[PDB]
Amino acid sequence: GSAKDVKFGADARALMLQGVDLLADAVAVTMGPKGRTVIIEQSWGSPKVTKDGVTVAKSIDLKDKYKNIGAKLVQDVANNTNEEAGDGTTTATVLARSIAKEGFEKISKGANPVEIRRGVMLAVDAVIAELKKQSKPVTTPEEIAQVATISANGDKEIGNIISDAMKKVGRKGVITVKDGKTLNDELEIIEGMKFDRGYISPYFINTSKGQKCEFQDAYVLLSEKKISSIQSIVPALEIANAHRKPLVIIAEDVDGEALSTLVLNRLKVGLQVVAVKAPGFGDNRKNQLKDMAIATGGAVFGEEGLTLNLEDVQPHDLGKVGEVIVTKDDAMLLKGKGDKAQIEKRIQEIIEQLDVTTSEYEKEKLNERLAKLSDGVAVLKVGGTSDVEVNEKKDRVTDALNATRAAVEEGIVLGGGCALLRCIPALDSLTPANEDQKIGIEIIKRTLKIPAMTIAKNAGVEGSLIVEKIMQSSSEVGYDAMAGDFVNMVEKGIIDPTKVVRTALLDAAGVASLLTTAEVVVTEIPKE
Amino acid sequence: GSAKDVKFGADARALMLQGVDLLADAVAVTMGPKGRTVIIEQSWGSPKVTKDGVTVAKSIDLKDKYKNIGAKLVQDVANNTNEEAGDGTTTATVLARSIAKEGFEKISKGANPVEIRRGVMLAVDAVIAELKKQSKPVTTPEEIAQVATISANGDKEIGNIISDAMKKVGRKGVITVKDGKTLNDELEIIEGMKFDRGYISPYFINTSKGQKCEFQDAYVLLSEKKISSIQSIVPALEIANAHRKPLVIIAEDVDGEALSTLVLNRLKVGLQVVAVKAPGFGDNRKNQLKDMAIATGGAVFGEEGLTLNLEDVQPHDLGKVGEVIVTKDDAMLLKGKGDKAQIEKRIQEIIEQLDVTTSEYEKEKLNERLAKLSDGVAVLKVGGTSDVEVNEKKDRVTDALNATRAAVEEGIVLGGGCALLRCIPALDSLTPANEDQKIGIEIIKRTLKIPAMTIAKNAGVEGSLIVEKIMQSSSEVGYDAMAGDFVNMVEKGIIDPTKVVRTALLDAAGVASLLTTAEVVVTEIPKE
Amino acid sequence: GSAKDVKFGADARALMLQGVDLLADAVAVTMGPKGRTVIIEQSWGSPKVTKDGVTVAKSIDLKDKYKNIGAKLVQDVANNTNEEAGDGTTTATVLARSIAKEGFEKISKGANPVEIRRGVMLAVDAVIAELKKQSKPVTTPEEIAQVATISANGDKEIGNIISDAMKKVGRKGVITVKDGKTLNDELEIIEGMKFDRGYISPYFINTSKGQKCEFQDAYVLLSEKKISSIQSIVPALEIANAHRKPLVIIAEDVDGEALSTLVLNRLKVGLQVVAVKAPGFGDNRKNQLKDMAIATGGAVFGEEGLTLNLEDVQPHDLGKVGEVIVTKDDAMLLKGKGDKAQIEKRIQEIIEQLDVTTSEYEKEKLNERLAKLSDGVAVLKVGGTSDVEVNEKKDRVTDALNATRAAVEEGIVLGGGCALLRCIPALDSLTPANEDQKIGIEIIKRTLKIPAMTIAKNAGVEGSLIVEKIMQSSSEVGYDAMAGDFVNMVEKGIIDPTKVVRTALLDAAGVASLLTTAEVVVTEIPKE
Amino acid sequence: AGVEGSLIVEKIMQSSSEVGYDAMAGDFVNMVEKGIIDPTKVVRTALLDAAGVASLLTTAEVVVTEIPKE
């Protein structure tokens, strides 16, 4: 195969620990307030300017093979935490390094690194079991605003926007962020359903405005397969013209012949119609048109084993929507009169359909159908003046938005590091089975101070001195690293999700305590 | 991934600031009168010779990875200002460097660069709020001549041509510049309609002059698809011969058969006809022939979903024009009797169709339809003796022309930098929330002096000395850097659009105050 | 993008001027009599041996990035002058360098190069305004003989040949030069039209002479596409035989079926016909046969969108010519009865088409159509024994021929440089607006002595001493650099076109006075 | 002095016998009246020492030099 190079013992430990220290010194500066950004060279355009501690970690790839092993294993810590919780990735990386450093010190000839690993995990289990006890559910809509304000680097506008969006959509609603264009942030609460597809012919525009077709109290014709002929399309339009209401035609496509009839009747006397294709792309639209059908109340035509055909339609067989808006790239149905008692049964089917399966894409479009249908979705167009700014402000908004959605399900706990500092008394009652498990528990006991310590450090004060004066203090008191003094937390509004705290700790301790059991390292030769 | 290299703290700050200082020293020389040109090597031919601070900034790309980071982020400022306002890009780059340099000094261990950022933006909000107070709208057509004269590097011919072109077309008309051929500048005001296409057969020439077919009070036949046969063409000519008026035939093409008919009846007894193809090329001509129709009063034949056919024409179904001029490469319709009340409704449609969309090509041919139809457009053929010369003057004409269109919409304000210098008293009443925001406000208070200071520096005098004596002086007094003495401004005619001043400041402060929050820089390894 | 390297201030100035000084030192040696040749290596064959200052300027491309910028900007001066006038390229380059050198000295910290530029152009405008006063039209045919003899480097045979060719064709006729084969120069005056293509079958020879087909008062049949079948050719012959006149058949080709008929009717009773293909090769013949048509009066058959077919011809539809001469390799039509008032409109059409465009091949075959069309034309087959000689002597003839045609339209003036020396008094009455415009006027005032000075220098004498002794002398007295003594000029026959003198000054002053405005230079890195 | 050399020399030789160039004021003057003079001894030895030495250098056809070892 490929020529390799092996290194044993303390030499390899040091080099890997050198790789860990570098990638963690790069990210540790981005912690808490008074943290500082990191500029990353993009290979093509203007550079990134981040504060998120995974963008910093996934970039840093080191030349040396052994230091790079350290970097990769810290990258995997930072990434496991991000996907699981969405914030707290700096918190994990400093905890990972601290367990690595303290581990590559206790490795003498008589020590057993694997029992040390077992002791670390006993300590970690005990501490996340202590977090859940001192956890408390988030109840008031003000605690939502605080969690957001904190994880957004203390930007209070962000906190009010995410709290407002979560009152008007539901705490488990669908908030999603976009690249805004204006200078300020905007909360847009979409009402109804909308799909990324516009009218076929630019003759349906009846608005004399920004290229819109706008209807009220329309019928809906849902077709699975194409509407080719003049034959299949005529009966529906006779219904629409007779009842004197507009008509929307959502089909796989409108062929040129039925299209030519639609355009004709629009331009003279002036029948009110409009056509758009289906949302797409394949098997999905077959479910989503059916979703559209029952949301409005009607039937999808051409169905496989029902094959409702177009030639025999009836006015109850058409859906009804209060307002219809269609532009050159997107259509919106708003107030479907769809017998809510039945659209709710649909919601229950789709939610059971996701609990069953997972494919990262079947579950993706699955959630698209839920959100599109009921409570409407919120979007957060962020302001800014230049690109790199918007991209920075956007990394902070998503970290705040993940924090709030991870807090509403699993409660809040003190911040500034005090969450973990208030767990050390839990470790002081463990009775280890042997000497090596005692070493592991002592490793975590030291490591729990790292978060509070690294925040004070970036603030410019003595880290460990602040950590001690916190522990001596009462249970609700800790350090506000912005104001630079000690405060009650919840009264002052410093809190963190318990989910982000425990997953960061658990992913760090998980990977770090395994690195420390190594004795050999095998690397590819660095040919050229 | 790619082997990377990280640098921390003061070392990295220094390297990026070196990249910034270089790219800004290169562009700063091109400021104000007595500014100086910059020769840029073009990779293929003779070099460019500019004074615009984006051609200078976008060209300069650096070898070192860290210096290039500084340069790229200054290109982004200069570019954001150009697209948003069209002038003021040097003003942006020097303001940017001043905010970076002043920022890479206050970064001690206890400073919070992110709060300093917040203070910088507090200062910028208050100052653009003060510019808007001391601003005034542009009213007299002498103020238009002045703004144009200033932004053209003090070339008064440019000021008179643009004011003349803007008086005869409207302050929001359509002026466009071209590479002239003569030695002097020319203002050509196209009045009416014209498209770049001539007659098919050189037998329609009835002029006994420079190869022209020239008619008065003619009919117009607008056909979308080809005129193949004798059958479809014959009825229109019977109308033309019966009423005894000439006829123009604007179609996609005139086939050899209908063509052989047209030439025959022209060469004997002497029916007055002439034919041309459509403007082109594809979907566009379909709208553009429709535009011509309502401009003259008639109907496009063969239309998709109207299919007005040629066999049943009627004399009212033909357009009418006062005079028709057709050469071997272009046709001009002048005085269409087209029911102006309806073509204005058309104009309003096309203007909303551009405000809605943008594709750089749909919006291109879109403006072609306004101009071709609307109040005659002005075109400016610039003189010169050699090519590199014309490209310089053309960079200056466009910056002069962009400035006037940014003054007519958003008012004017003092020039020479005095616009910003007259805002410092606004900053002196800010009450910063903490120490870090106070640092930011002082950063801006110093930076506001940079524009006036860099103009005096380029003039060969002491920069800060001129700045001090201006502030001591009255509100209308400041420095004329060409005459080299202090003057009232508006009476002397030194003014700038408020839009260019505010966007230059805002794009610089936005980008620069984020660079100064950095603590780490990660760059790809420079392999070879 | 590509890594670039910037240089500021005097360093950059020095290097560019080194490039200007190099490219201009190389060319100055080819000036006036006693100038000297320049050997250029051709990458493929035997080298060039020139005296023209554009062949020398366009070759020299420099290694260093900064020296090459200077070289290119002097190339642009020499090229703009050649295209505008056809001679005077050495005069321009020494004037360009002199303005560059004198410009890269006065650039101190307080000087404004842009105002110096304005003064330079004020001075150039005033001096080209003085040339036209002291200009006088060329009237006698001996002044033509002198203008030609001078710019041909004092070759008196060249002067007599060009004067003779211009007497027999008109001073604005079409003279054109070719690579002769003999040892001496030859003046051949073609009469009528001619193309390099002979009869198809060697049976049309009715001459009993040197292999010629010779007709008088013939018809002409012009076909764009081939004459394939017996069907298309017979009616034309029926007409030609009916009226009892010969017939010429100019088509893309005469296929073997129609050919066997033409030859058959030729060999028995003796119908007078003859066939030749078109001039060629592709799109050109489509225009060139049409040119031939209107010159004789008729129609080209098979046309694209007129498709005049061969089957329906008529005797007015055939061209008529006074005499027809066809050999084995070329055909000549002489006295086309073509309603000349329109071929003149055609000639004016083709002449404007070349002034508009240039492609070295569109303009090449373009000139083929003028001469082929015009009545008569002169050609000058130059002698010589080897190629490099002919290429040289041919370079001098064209410069003489451009000179005489530039004198007949715009008058003559004293020579040897004395034309400009006699303009300095105009500069001494300018009143400059400021110090910088004063600096510029002095730049030109110094620069006007350069031509006389560089000619005396090359003659082996002291340059400025000859310049001084001229200015003290009367207005008609100056220096004959061949005889080496002072003479009246017009009596002695040393004169230059005013068009060549003024364009030389103006293109140099334009470009150089812009180079002298530079303060930064941006160049691509020279990787490898 | 910053002017064209041979041009001043020509305008001097054209002039009268006492007229020449004062290079400080930058104009032509009578000399003794204005006070520009030099000893005849210094002029003649300068020419004679130069012409002597130089006119022998120009008679050379070969040059022999010691090798520049190091």
Ligand SMILES: Nc1ncnc2c1ncn2[C@@H]1O[C@H](COP(=O)(O)OP(=O)(O)O)[C@@H](O)[C@H]1O
């Ligand atoms: N104003 C503040 N005062 C004190 N501690 C804070 C403040 N804001 C955030 N923190 C703490 O800093 C830590 C960093 O939060 P998180 O967003 O996970 O880290 P990062 O800075 O990497 O985003 C959290 O534990 C949080 O409690």
Ligand SMILES: Nc1ncnc2c1ncn2[C@@H]1O[C@H](COP(=O)(O)OP(=O)(O)O)[C@@H](O)[C@H]1O
């Ligand atoms: N003649 C002048 N005297 C004093 N100041 C001037 C003069 N002309 C322009 N300025 C000022 O110089 C600044 C440069 O304007 P801008 O169009 O950005 O020039 P550049 O394009 O070189 O950057 C403006 O703020 C303008 O008001």
Ligand SMILES: Nc1ncnc2c1ncn2[C@@H]1O[C@H](COP(=O)(O)OP(=O)(O)O)[C@@H](O)[C@H]1O
């Ligand atoms: N015999 C001559 N004596 C003095 N001056 C001359 C003579 N012949 C030409 N000249 C001058 O030399 C100048 C340079 O002419 P140009 O055409 O540029 O030379 P070339 O064509 O060889 O480059 C012209 O202005 C011309 O008047």
Ligand code: BEF
């Ligand atoms: F960088 Be944070 F702790 F997600």
Ligand code: BEF
């Ligand atoms: F360089 Be300018 F201020 F656009």
Ligand code: BEF
């Ligand atoms: F060099 Be010459 F005047 F064309």
Ligand SMILES: [K+]
């Ligand atoms: K972070």
Ligand SMILES: [K+]
């Ligand atoms: K500029």
Ligand SMILES: [K+]
């Ligand atoms: K020459």
Ligand SMILES: [Mg+2]
């Ligand atoms: Mg984060």
Ligand SMILES: [Mg+2]
């Ligand atoms: Mg500009």
Ligand SMILES: [Mg+2]
């Ligand atoms: Mg020449």
